Amino acid sequence: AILTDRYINRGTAFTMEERQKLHILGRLPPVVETLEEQVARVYGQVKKYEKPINRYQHLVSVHSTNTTLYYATILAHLEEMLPIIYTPTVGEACMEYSHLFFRERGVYFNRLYKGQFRNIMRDAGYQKVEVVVITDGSRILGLGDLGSNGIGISIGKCSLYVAGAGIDPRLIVPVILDVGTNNERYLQDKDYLGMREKRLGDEEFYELLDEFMEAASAEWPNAVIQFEDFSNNHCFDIMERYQKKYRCFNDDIQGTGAVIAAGFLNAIKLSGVSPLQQRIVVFGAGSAAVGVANNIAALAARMYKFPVQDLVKTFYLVDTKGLVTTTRGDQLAAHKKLLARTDVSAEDSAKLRTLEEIVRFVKPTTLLGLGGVGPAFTEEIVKMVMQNTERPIIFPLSNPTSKAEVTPENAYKWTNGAAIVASGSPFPPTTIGGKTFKPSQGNNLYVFPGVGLGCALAQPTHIPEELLLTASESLNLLTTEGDLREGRLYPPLEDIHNISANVATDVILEAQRMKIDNNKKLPRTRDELLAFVKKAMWKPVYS
Amino acid sequence: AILTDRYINRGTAFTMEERQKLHILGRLPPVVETLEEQVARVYGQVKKYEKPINRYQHLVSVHSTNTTLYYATILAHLEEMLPIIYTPTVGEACMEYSHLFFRERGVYFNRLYKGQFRNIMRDAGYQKVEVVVITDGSRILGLGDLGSNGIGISIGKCSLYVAGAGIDPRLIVPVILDVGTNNERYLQDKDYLGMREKRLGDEEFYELLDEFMEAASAEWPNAVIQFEDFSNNHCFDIMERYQKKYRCFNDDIQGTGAVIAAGFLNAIKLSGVSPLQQRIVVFGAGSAAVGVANNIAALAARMYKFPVQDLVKTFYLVDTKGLVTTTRGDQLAAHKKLLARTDVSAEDSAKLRTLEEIVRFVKPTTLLGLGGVGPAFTEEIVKMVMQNTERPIIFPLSNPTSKAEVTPENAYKWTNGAAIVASGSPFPPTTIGGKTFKPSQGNNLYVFPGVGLGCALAQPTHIPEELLLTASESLNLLTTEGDLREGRLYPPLEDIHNISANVATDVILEAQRMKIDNNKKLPRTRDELLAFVKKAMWKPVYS
Numbered sequence A, B: 001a002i003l004t005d006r007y008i009n010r011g012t013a014f015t016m017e018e019r020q021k022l023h024i025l026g027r028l029p030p031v032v033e034t035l036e037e038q039v040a041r042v043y044g045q046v047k048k049y050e051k052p053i054n055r056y057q058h059l060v061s062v063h064s065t066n067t068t069l070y071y072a073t074i075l076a077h078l079e080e081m082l083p084i085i086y087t088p089t090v091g092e093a094c095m096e097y098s099h100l101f102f103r104e105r106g107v108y109f110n111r112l113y114k115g116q117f118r119n120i121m122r123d124a125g126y127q128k129v130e131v132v133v134i135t136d137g138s139r140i141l142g143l144g145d146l147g148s149n150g151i152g153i154s155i156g157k158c159s160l161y162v163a164g165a166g167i168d169p170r171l172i173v174p175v176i177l178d179v180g181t182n183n184e185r186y187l188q189d190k191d192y193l194g195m196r197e198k199r200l201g202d203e204e205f206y207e208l209l210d211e212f213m214e215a216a217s218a219e220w221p222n223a224v225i226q227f228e229d230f231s232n233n234h235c236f237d238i239m240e241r242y243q244k245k246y247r248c249f250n251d252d253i254q255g256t257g258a259v260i261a262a263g264f265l266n267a268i269k270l271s272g273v274s275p276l277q278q279r280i281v282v283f284g285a286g287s288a289a290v291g292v293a294n295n296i297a298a299l300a301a302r303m304y305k306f307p308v309q310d311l312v313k314t315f316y317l318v319d320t321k322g323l324v325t326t327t328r329g330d331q332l333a334a335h336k337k338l339l340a341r342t343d344v345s346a347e348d349s350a351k352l353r354t355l356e357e358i359v360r361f362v363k364p365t366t367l368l369g370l371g372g373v374g375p376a377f378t379e380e381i382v383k384m385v386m387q388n389t390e391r392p393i394i395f396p397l398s399n400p401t402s403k404a405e406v407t408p409e410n411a412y413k414w415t416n417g418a419a420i421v422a423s424g425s426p427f428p429p430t431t432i433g434g435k436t437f438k439p440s441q442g443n444n445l446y447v448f449p450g451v452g453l454g455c456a457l458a459q460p461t462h463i464p465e466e467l468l469l470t471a472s473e474s475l476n477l478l479t480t481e482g483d484l485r486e487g488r489l490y491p492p493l494e495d496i497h498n499i500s501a502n503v504a505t506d507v508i509l510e511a512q513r514m515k516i517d518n519n520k521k522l523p524r525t526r527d528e529l530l531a532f533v534k535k536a537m538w539k540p541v542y543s
């Protein structure tokens, strides 16, 4: 019963004396290993596979037999395992290898079960659930509708809360809300196991998602509900609908802006050009891109008490037409108005269409790549920014690497190593003249696990914007003098347990200051709280 | 508890009413499938993988979650799945992917556990075990010593008793007797989990194997012990040591000779050249090759009551020196003496060295390829056999296909479709002049599962040679007039349940005639017994 329970199984780490006592001597090969030795063996077993999907499949096999060994392997090799266990491999697993997820916990909802959602949750037989990740498979980036196969996205994201913040793997629940699929291949595929129908309209979509939120608030009252990989037609509206009434957040929207804001303020500190002297080209004018700009302005206003209006005036927003201005003659989308230039004439607007002429005119010190249209930050454009600052801040954040505005290698080459670079994706180091440069990766893992652990301990009534901004600031402040002297914008990803403990600590203190915390057992002073949070974390060691 | 038990789990075959009643509605995607629909889906999931090892890995995943669906998929696609689930894929899985077997039942013995073998078996907590497959990883063919990783061979072979003869998958036990490894890579491999030592000498080897046989006879008294993939230094001696005292057999030795003898006697019937008119070149003079010849002579003597001495005189044995004769001047190995020619002069012996001149002199009607040295049956040699018979019998049985004496395609091409061919391996059909030919595969699956089911029902004291010869004859007689009219030498592999039920029936009747049967509940007449055996078989359907 211990060997066959993946939560308590130790495999070859059972000592000979333990195997004798548990009557399992003949169930294992005779070698006895420590957990670090098992992790080294698993890491070799993974790297025997060349393709990410086969590495993923091997890690699923480990997780199904020895959960402690799985999470110990991820924690020892995190940067390398992240592309396998989540984006982009998990989406390819969902799309073409959905059987990899069948044996996992997954809770499936659809219109056939209307009015039974609470019964289904009760039936799942979990105890004090802490984190629930839900998707409908619609995709934040709107590529590759997964329908019911989106359950693998929720499974993968749940796993990152365990690895990142020590959420006990028994207290995470992955959910698929199957409201149909517009995936034409799936709609015709004899082997598609989900609802074989186009996506439900908004009225029915919200009827079912409302029942889900109300059922989860009753049956899983201790949980944070995290929306993952919902399409843009719904993801912003879901948060407007639920943010005050339920304990919920959207990582794609709120996590991303908190992580990019933290890293960007550290790039300002390194750059020699202080926040009010920055001239920031925001290349891309989607709701998400404007959210990131507003999250930067909010964080600088918190950290430095500059008037937020003056920080807004540092942004130069570029949409598909050109520089967004109040004078260029069009009716602006609501989200573009607050960053529109008021200081540019109609005549100058007409001559500010191409990114090259916009950069020549604006004289920016920062280029924020949120454009999703490929390598817009040319050598000529990067060379112009070198005219305005000694340390250009260049953030090519569009995903995947082919949609990205510039490679970190080109950014460093064209500035002779002056560029301060953050990426959505990991890159190898670049060496110029014997000096080494490596971009800072703004991975969402820096924030969501600590928000989850914080909301799990404090049990806040809801997750107001204050808790995300506090997580953003906490992350910024974790970047040490040492980190900064080596050009890093974030604390190191390998230190994610300490990072999450600190983010969670600061989130709790903010919930306590707002009197929204329902858990009154927690310390209310930072040093004693941080020690308490660290002790509360599940660790991937045998105990 | 039903979803997580692979023996009772039905996955998507649970109806909506059943999901309601079992409180599992939210645990599955909403599509309800029949077992045949699930099998079609799994077969597509398998064929999405190009490499055998990745197909194997996918089938392991099915087996770990839904045992009924795994065995239903094998039974629906048997010929195609056999190369994946056993030779040669299972050996490659053992050698390089041994982690595929960690979660499976496996019972591990070694010298560290001397005197505790019975305790280890008791600890395994099985009920009335029927079949135990044991290996030491030494390899029958002596290539790729697997040591402790030989457990995967036992696991794969156990699975074939379930698929082939409906041994209940709860009543099969795979065993590794780890007596060391001569695999130099393993002996230096930090991740090898077995006994890190060269193979024990014979005295210690037999001390431990004796304890195993005695322990299994006490703790698993209802079981057949089947030796799999033991090296030639031990496999013949193990059977001499144990055959009378324990319920045991070796498939490599006894199964192979029973299957080849059955197919060869059907080739004689098709050929127009009756057993006493056959002139059989036995190319290869190993113990195994002489065993196959002796099994043919024994079966013909049983079926036709020709004097066995006259059947022996139909064989012309060829070793590495040439035609084995009493006059060629050397001291013959014991196994070669009984097939040595007494009718060839010393002078003719000296001129009978190359296979070509041996064939020209002997004027054979059959070529039996048991040589293991590549494509010895040349066009010139096949063309000479066409001079001696209208239907050359050509059996290239050396493994793998590169060691084989002739391709079936070349055999049929060079004889314009007259050749009667059996292979160890599967081959595609050959079309000559719009007429189609396909070799008969002498797969060991024809015999061992039915011997296992027979020995499981009758509970004989031991497995004397009479039970193997009866299985051989039963298999021969299952080839219908219809089968024979289409050139088949065996009943079709897809019909393996009916085949095994009939082999088991005949084996039981032989045990009853010898008064070695311990199970007195069984019918003693063939029709009523065969019905009883069919009912006793585990079937891969939901019940």
Ligand SMILES: O=C(Nc1cccc(S(=O)(=O)Nc2ccccc2F)c1)c1cnccn1
Pocket (backbone or CB within 6 Å): A003, A004, A009, A010, A011, A012, A013, A027, A028, A029, A038, A041, A042, A045, A061, A062, A065, A066, A069, B099, B102, B103, B104, B105
């Ligand atoms: O856990 C079992 N066995 C085991 C054997 C060797 C090694 C390990 S391990 O847990 O040390 N490593 C491991 C396990 C999985 C897949 C990849 C792995 F590397 C475990 C078991 C569980 N139930 C039943 C019978 N055995």
Ligand SMILES: O=C(Nc1cccc(S(=O)(=O)Nc2ccccc2F)c1)c1cnccn1
Pocket (backbone or CB within 6 Å): A099, A102, A103, A104, A105, B003, B004, B009, B010, B011, B012, B013, B027, B028, B029, B038, B041, B042, B045, B061, B062, B065, B066, B069
């Ligand atoms: O059995 C479970 N789920 C399941 C989902 C879809 C489909 C099937 S299936 O059993 O229909 N097919 C199948 C299962 C395995 C791997 C390849 C497969 F094709 C099963 C389960 C078991 N425990 C816990 C939660 N779920």
